[PDB]
Design a protein around this ligand. Structure first.
Ligand SMILES: O=C(O)c1ccnc(-c2ccnc(NCc3cccnc3)n2)c1
Ligand SMILES: [Cl-]
Ligand SMILES: [Cl-]
Ligand SMILES: [Cl-]
Ligand SMILES: [Fe+2]
Ligand SMILES: [Zn+2]
Length: 344
């Protein structure tokens, strides 16, 4: 009930200061759902036109093969040859891959879960780049100016799609599997244009229960890596979440809207048709404890690992020594707002 997804409508004055707005929506309890929508002021636009991007290269499109049954699936990625947005769009909008006919979201959703394993779509994922113009200073995914920037500006370490922006070109039925962000960071997702993106969310206070459930259904995977959900290959239908008593909410994001995900907010979803979304990670002071406690995948090589030392040193100086001795036993309360939210 207080873990349901909220939508916010900032004025241009509220929108101006990013980290301040995030702190505001946490004061209203937005973080409890693990996901929140923000509809920007009708005046604001990140780009003048999306006609001049047909020559943009998607270097590594992915075909999404999905195997499973009874609401439990595993997704396998087959990388395909580079293509342009124009060539992707043509395939997306072709008769073979286009959105089927439907009336209500519920019908499209039933079609997603019924046809998930058929006709594998192509996802134009993880494209380095921004579609914002340089002048745009509000909610600019390339330069949000949050404390996550301390990873670059204390070690020159750049982590693609984490402290830099990614673009995602979707088509009908392309999916994102159940996961939290690397290091349990926040994320920001802006749908530039096109057909909607629908999302499922589990409240961070029920995150562990989702993990216990997924371990039960994939014991082999859980055995090879405790954090296997971080492989971003596990899909689980809402019918199964409901059957096993996991609380979740759903929301559809339309072009021109932001979705924010919160630390330890498990999320998943799918694209309704051809679209383009930009995203990256960010942090607030509240995140630091999640970062310190995040359960990481070590079974693969290049996995995103951020050193927490700089954060603990700067923002928790009184706990640094204990933390470094491995004796910090701080317990996270998923209901508390970020320190920054006391203003509101
Ligand atoms: O397809 C989408 O629209 C979507 C939505 C939400 N999350 C993701 C997503 C997919 C994969 N990883 C992460 N988060 C961690 C991460 C790690 C490295 C680079 N970028 C992100 N998020 C993708
Ligand atoms: Cl309560
Ligand atoms: Cl077309
Ligand atoms: Cl560390
Ligand atoms: Fe994500
Ligand atoms: Zn792993």
């Amino acid at each position: 009930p207080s873990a349901r997804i909220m939508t916010f409508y900032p004025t241009m004055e509220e929108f101006r200061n990013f980290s301040r707005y995030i702190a505001y929506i946490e004061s209203q309890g937005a973080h409890r759902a693990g996901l929140a929508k923000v509809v920007p002021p009708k005046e604001w636009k990140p780009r003048a036109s999306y006609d001049d991007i047909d020559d943009l290269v998607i270097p590594a499109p992915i075909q999404q093969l999905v195997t499973g049954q009874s609401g439990l699936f595993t997704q396998y990625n087959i990388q395909k040859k580079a293509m342009t947005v124009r060539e992707f769009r043509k395939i997306a909008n072709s008769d073979k891959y286009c959105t089927p006919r439907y009336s209500e979201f519920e019908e499209l959703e039933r079609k997603y879960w019924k046809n998930l394993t058929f006709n594998p779509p192509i996802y134009g994922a993880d494209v380095n780049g921004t579609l914002y113009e340089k002048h745009v200073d509000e909610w600019n995914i390339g330069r949000l100016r949050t404390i996550l920037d301390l990873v670059e500006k204390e070690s020159g370490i750049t982590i693609e799609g984490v402290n830099t922006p990614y673009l995602y070109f979707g088509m009908w039925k392309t999916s994102f599997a159940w996961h939290t962000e690397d290091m349990d960071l926040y994320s920001i997702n802006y749908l530039h244009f096109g057909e909607p993106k629908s999302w499922y969310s589990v409240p961070p206070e029920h995150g562990k229960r989702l993990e216990r459930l997924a371990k039960g259904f994939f014991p082999g995977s859980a055995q090879s890596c405790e954090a296997f959900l971080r492989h971003k290959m596990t899909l689980i239908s809402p019918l199964m979440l409901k059957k096993y008593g996991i609380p979740f909410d759903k929301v559809t994001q339309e072009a021109g809207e932001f979705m924010i995900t919160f630390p330890y907010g498990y999320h998943a979803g799918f694209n309704h048709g051809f679209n383009c979304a930009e995203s990256t990670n960010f942090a607030t002071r509240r995140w630091i404890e999640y970062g310190k406690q995040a359960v990481l995948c070590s079974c693969r090589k290049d996995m995103v690992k951020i050193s927490m030392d700089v954060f603990v040193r700067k923002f928790q100086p009184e706990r640094y020594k204990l933390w470094k001795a491995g004796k910090d036993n701080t317990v996270i309360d998923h209901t508390l707002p970020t320190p920054e939210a006391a203003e509101f």
